[PDB]
C-alpha cells in the first residue's frame, strides 16, 4: 500500500522508445501499455513523467525507428491529458527532479499516487518470457 | 451593445487560441478557415508577448514538435500594422494581460485601423465552439 516514493519504484513500470518501437504491432499493445509509465519529450529540452492511460491512432502514419506507425499514447500528467506520438518517449531514465515534479502534480492534481503493490502487479504482467 | 468595439481584455479572450488548442486542431481539416479571425498570445522574445490577430496559415521549412505532434505550420500574424508568420510553438496557453491588451489598442489606434465588434467577436466564437 505504500505509494511510489523513489524514481527507481517508477522505472519498474517506464516503457523505452526501443521497447514500444518493438512493441507497436503486436496484437496487445493497449492492454500491454496502459498502467506504464514514459519519460516523454513535451518540446522545448523539457522531458515529463508521464502514465500511458490508452492508445489511439493519430492522423497521421509516422517513422518510428524502423518502423512506421500510427498509435499515439494517451498520456497523463496530473490533469494535463493529451495524445503524444510514440517517437516523443525518452530512451533514458526518469530524473529526481522529474519524478518530484510529477509527484507534485498528482498531489496538486488531487490525484491518488500509485502504489508499489500495483507497480509490481504491472511490472509482472508484462514480464516478456 | 453588440455594435460597440471591443475595449476590454475578457471580451478579447473569447476567440483567444491557447497552444494546446492549436496543437488539438493543426491536423483536421478546414484548420486555416477555423482559425483566422481568432488572436493569439504570441511569444516575441526576452519574456515578452503580444497580442496578434491571426490572418492565415502557411507552410514554413522548419518541421518542428509542436506537444504531441509534428508540423510545419505557420500562423501570418497582425498586429496593427505589423505581420510576420511565426511557428505555432511560440503562442502563450496563458490569457492575455491587460498590459498586452492596451499595448495591442495602441497599435491599432497608431495604425488608424478599427477594433472588432461584440457582435463580430461574439460570432467568430460561436463559429468556434467545440461540441
Known sequence: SQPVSLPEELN???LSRHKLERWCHMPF??????????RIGIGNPVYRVAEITGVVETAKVYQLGGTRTNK???????????????????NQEFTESEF???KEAMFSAGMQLPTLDEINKKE???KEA
Open 124 to 126: 509482472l504482467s508484462i
Open 12 to 14: 519498474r513500470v517506464r
Open 29 to 38: 499493445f493497449a492492454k500491454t501499455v496502459t498502467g506504464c509509465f514514459v
Open 100 to 102: 518530484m515534479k510529477w
Open 72 to 90: 499515439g499514447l494517451q498520456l497523463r500528467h496530473g490533469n494535463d491529458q493529451r495524445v503524444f506520438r510514440l517517437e516523443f518517449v525518452s
